[PDB]
Curated annotation (Swiss-Prot):
Organism: Escherichia coli (strain K12)
Protein name: Thiol:disulfide interchange protein DsbE
Thioredoxin domain span: 2-121
Keywords for this protein: Cell inner membrane, Cell membrane, Cytochrome c-type biogenesis, Disulfide bond, Membrane, Redox-active center, Transmembrane, Transmembrane helix
Compartment(s): Cell inner membrane
A single BP term in Gene Ontology: cytochrome complex assembly
Disulfide bonds: 24-27
Recorded GO CC terms: outer membrane-bounded periplasmic space; plasma membrane
Protein family: Belongs to the thioredoxin family. DsbE subfamily.
Protein task: Involved in disulfide bond formation. Catalyzes a late, reductive step in the assembly of periplasmic c-type cytochromes, probably the reduction of disulfide bonds of the apocytochrome c to allow covalent linkage with the heme. Possible subunit of a heme lyase. DsbE is maintained in a reduced state by DsbD.
Reported impact of residue 24 to S: Drastic decrease in activity
Length: 128
């Protein structure tokens, strides 16, 4: 069990927080897409939710780990309030630890390209 300060997750810059599970139908494809965004330099923090830890681990080994930091059930965050949340959701947090967007559903090229990416750029320039 590990707890993290908000600043450790953001490092003073925007970050994506993805809440996922192996039982989630759209999460397999989403995972593969995150590997792509992660390669493009996007910092992503993962939160495995209401899932079997061992199955999540195997999932990350088989398909790869796009997460800079990976959290599981039992882990927590300090200084970051997500309110009522759960899988499948993706949050955009700015460099100051403020939630600037939340998307319920799977993260795919369209949501990223049309909805989130512009906000990400917005706060990237603001943090820099």
């Amino acid at each position: 069990m590990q707890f993290y300060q908000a600043d450790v997750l953001t490092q003073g810059k925007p970050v994506l927080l993805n809440v996922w599970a192996t039982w989630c139908p759209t999460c397999r494809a989403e995972h593969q897409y995150l590997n792509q965004l992660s390669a493009q330099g996007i910092r992503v923090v993962g939160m495995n939710y209401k899932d079997d830890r061992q199955k999540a681990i195997s999932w990350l080994k088989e398909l790869g780990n796009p997460y800079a930091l990976s959290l599981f059930d039992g882990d927590g965050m300090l200084g970051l309030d997500l309110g009522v949340y759960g899988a499948p959701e993706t949050f955009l947090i700015d460099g100051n630890g403020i939630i600037r967007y939340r998307h319920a559903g799977d993260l795919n090229p369209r949501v990223w390209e049309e909805e989130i990416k512009p906000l990400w750029e917005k706060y990237s320039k603001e943090a820099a």
